[PDB]
């Protein structure tokens, strides 16, 4: 009658470690966890990724935070599956977006 | 695109049928002027006897290519098949993925349009 | 007769499919998710039973006993080794 | 060419199971037919050509008990 | 597209239960044929796709016993 | 549209049982015939639908035994 | 109205047996051929009707046994 | 009227297995042909019915045995 | 030996359906996918 | 010179499986007839060909077990 | 009879396959391509190999050994210590 | 002359496997037709005439086991 | 060697009947002076009455011979069948393989062309 | 009259295995057709020939054994 189906939540793809890093942010929306995020042009505050600046990609997300967020967690370190991260719907390329992170300790399996 | 679910059939059936048996033709002149076509060529034999008796004889050559390649041909214009050199005399209706082209020999004869 | 049984043991059962090898034994029997030629080790955990579609399957060969008469046919050549040698059967074998 | 291969594969297998799987094509004068395949092998190659492809989930590795 | 394709499943079954599957069709001139499938075949195949989609339950899983 | 589609696979059932499942029609220069389906798979089909649907059922349990 | 096809199907029986069921009509030009169903199956169906249908008593329940 | 019916049957059967069948009949243009049955078939309707219309005895309770 | 005796133990049964392989194993074996691990 | 017949071999497999291994070729008086070839026999020369050729990796042998 | 059962039990298994033998032996038996020696194999934990459709790897029933050879022996055995005059337990 | 027929048998193995074994031609009442073969004979002619030939090796003797 | 796919087995079956059927046939004066092909010959009988009774009773002999072979071979020029001797009155266009020699008995009537 | 015996029945059995045996051949109104054999039988017949004529070995005699 009432079926769902419960999948097991992994972040790591493989035993690379993952590690955090906290950094003010100048978010304008409301951004859920493990968004991708680029620094400023001019005041290189944090904000979540347009998917337009290409090689801008500096970190995902760690935990949920809004405006009110002065600073914020990301993960600097990790492989993460291409699918359990979600992209702005501008880069809609999958190309672009696996190599979004390429030349840093962030990678896309 | 066929609102038959049987014209793309026949005309898959002509694509596949020109390229496994068809050779090329090479047309010149005309709008088309130098271009590349597949058809499969055909010279049926054919015998007059003019007066008490002449012996003059002739073939009737024929093409049977597609008809979206064809359209805007006319009958002035020349065909050249390999090293073989025609003349479209004739054009046979759309039978819905093709039809026959009549061709003569060397040049044609004159205009005589007024 | 050691070595045979030894070969007759090694290849417990077999699968046919028509998919990636790796793939047919991560769907068939499991394990993968290796940390970094060997194919892929298998945990041996509980019971498992597989999934299977048309053109795959699963036979495990039931091999054959192993001693097919070999223990008696060497009780026989003991007795003619022990009758040659000149000391009793039952203190040569 | 995956994606597209496999799209125009599975539309054939659907139109074969519904009614328009041609056998010939014979218009007079013109006459040709297809090679006729069986439905098992075209499911089976289906499936492999899937799981070869980098589509989503289709199966899953044996299965587990407890108590 | 799923929900299309299963009613074009369920009536390509009925007609060919009933009456309504043509083999051929010729008209001096012009003629095609189409390959026959098996009943079975088109059974299991309009029950996968009946399970695959969207549809409500239709069968349940293995029946347990109490005293 | 149960009901009658059940009706009218009765009627074809009855038809072919007796005389009148056409194989094949043609006239000058026209012929189409219909595939043919055998006879279990036909009453099967009749008996799962008939049961399927909501009418007065004709299956009971499996039995019982008393002394 | 089981009984009109009851009656109907008994004289196809009939008819089919001894000589008269036509497997096939070919007019010039006018042709149609019907499905030709086997014995079996036609006394099968025979027997499931006139049974379901509330005719007399065919059968009764099985067999006693006494010394 | 099984007498008549059981009269003409057997009388087929002799002429059909004798000679005289005509699977098919031909004219200018006129086609007709019957469908075919096996022999032992009507040979087991032809005990049947006999056995089931009130004809004289054929059959007798087994056979016992004494010393 | 002893390990040709395992893994011919651990197998038991097996099934097949060309149906995707949870919803034949929950249909058919049960299952739990109500509630990787398979 | 084995990539190509790869390729070759794999397209004409797609083909075949979809709708387009064509069997008969007819032209009002010129007709060619290709022989037929199976599934089973095909895919076996796809896989023995790709194994022989620089194909990558694609195939493994045994399995390990380990508590 | 020793000859006959020593072939017999030393041929045990056998597999077939339509592609070159050095790559059916290596991803069949395992073997060690990575270094006629044809391909010797490890002896390791029990493995199962997989094969696509036209390969098939059967072993041998082989045959018993001693099918009644021992009784022939036994009455052979008599025989000859007969013609010896000496006791057949004592001779073998 | 070994490798020319090693050759034309390869050549000719590729060609029924991928599509264009002429089975039979003919063009106005000139038709000739070739008898056809085994997918299985012509592979293990193939590998005889291989090993008959200088080809290199292929097979090779059984295999040794070493703990 | 051609974009036919078909004209090579048009060509194979062309030269397998040749070989299972007709004769060789050697050639006499002309350009190609003596060679020896194969072909097969027929020889159908045609009657013509004219007037009251003029039956002239005789046949029409055609080889059905390779174009390649009989490449220029003109029309003035004889042909022996064996033992027997013919001359070349017509030689019908190719169908793709071959043609067929239309052949008269005796010798050729003059020229008569100036 | 072995030796070309055996030459021609190779190069028979060589262009059947690879195109060339030809069966039918017709020239409207002028056909013949020749029966085909089998190629195990053809094998083994061209074998025996080999074996029976005075050609180089081609067997030897069991094998032996030593330790």
Redesign the interface.
Known sequence: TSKETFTHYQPQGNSDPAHTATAPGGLSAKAPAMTPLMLDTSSRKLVAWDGTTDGAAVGILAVAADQTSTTLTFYKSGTFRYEDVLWPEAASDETKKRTAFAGTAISIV | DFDN??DA??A???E??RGYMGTSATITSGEQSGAVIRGVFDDPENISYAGQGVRVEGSSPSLFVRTDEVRQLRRGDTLTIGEENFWVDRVSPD??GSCHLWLGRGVPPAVNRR | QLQSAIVKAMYAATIES???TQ?AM???????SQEQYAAAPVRL???????L???DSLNLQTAQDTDNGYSVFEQSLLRYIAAGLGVSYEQLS | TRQE?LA??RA?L?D??????????????????????????????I??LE??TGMTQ?????????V
Not at chain 4, 58 to 66: C, H, I, Q
């Open positions: 679910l049987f059939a026949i898959r059936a002509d596949t049928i039978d819905g | 028509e998919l990636d793939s991560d769907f068939i029997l499991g394990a993968n955990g509980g019971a498992k039973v597989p999934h579609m048309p053109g | 291969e125009a594969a054939a659907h074969l199971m519904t009614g328009k799987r041609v056998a010939t094509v014979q218009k007079d004068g013109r006459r040709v037919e297809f090679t006729a395949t069986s439905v098992s092998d075209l499911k089976k190659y499936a492999e799981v070869q289709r199966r899953r590795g044996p299965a587990g008990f407890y």
